[PDB]
Structure 1
Amino acid sequence: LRPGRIDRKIEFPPPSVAARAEILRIHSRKMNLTRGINLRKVAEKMNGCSGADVKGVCTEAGMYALRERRIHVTQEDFELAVGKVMNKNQETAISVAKLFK
C-alpha cells in the first residue's frame, strides 16, 4: 500500500435491496415461475449480507418445487426458501464454525 504502488482501490459493499432484486431476476430466467410473484417482495423478505445468499434462495425454491413435483415455482416456496438461507447464515457465527468439520 506504499506510495505509487496502488493508485485505485475498489471497495465492494454488501448488496442493496434494489441490487439484491436484480440478482434474483437473473436467476428466475433459468426457472419456470408462476406469474404474479414479485421479486422486489422477495428481496425485501431477504436482507442478505453478500451476493452469496441470493443464489441459495433460488436453488432452494426449485428443490422445494422438485419435492412438490409440479413444474411451476410457487410464491410459498419463497417463504420457506428465504427462511432456510437466513437460518443457515446464523449457524456458522454463533461459535464461529467453518463450512467443514
Structure 2
Amino acid sequence: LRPGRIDRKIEFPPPSVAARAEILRIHSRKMNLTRGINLRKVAEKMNGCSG
C-alpha cells in the first residue's frame, strides 16, 4: 500500500441489479431461450448473489 509501489486500487463492488441483469443476459446467450424471457425480473429477484 506504500505509494510509489503498486499504483491503482480498483473496486469491484458486488454487482447491482442492472449489473446482475447485464451479466445474466451475457451468460444467457449460450442456450436455447424461449421468446420473451423477462431476465430483468429474474435479476431483480436475485439479491446478494454476485458474478
Based on CA coordinates, which of the two structures has the bigger radius of gyration? 1
State how 1:52-71 maps to structure 2 within 5 Å: none
Aligned length: 49
- Give, in angstroms, the shift of residue 26 of structure 1: 1.4
User: After the TM superposition, which segments of 4 or more aligned residues of structure 1 sit over 3 Å from their partners?
Assistant: none
- Give, in angstroms, the shift of residue 3 of structure 1: 2.4
Give 1:3's aligned residue: 3
Q: Which has the higher contact order (CA 8 A, sep 6+)?
A: 2
State how 1:1-101 maps to structure 2 within 5 Å: 1-49=1-49
More helix by share: 1
For 1:21-40, what per-residue CA distance to the aligned partner results, in whole angstroms no more than 9, with x for missing partners? 11111122111121121110
For structure 2, list consecutive stretches of 5 or more residues without a partner in the other structure: none
For structure 1, list consecutive stretches of 5 or more residues without a partner in the other structure: 50-101
Q: RMSD of aligned C-alpha atoms?
A: 1.3
For 1:4-47, what per-residue CA distance to the aligned partner results, in whole angstroms no more than 9, with x for missing partners? 11221111100010010111111221111211211100100101
TM-score for both structures, normalised by structure 2: 0.79
How many angstroms apart in 2 are the aligned matches of 1:48 and 1:31? 24
For 1:40-64, what per-residue CA distance to the aligned partner results, in whole angstroms no more than 9, with x for missing partners? 0010010134xxxxxxxxxxxxxxx
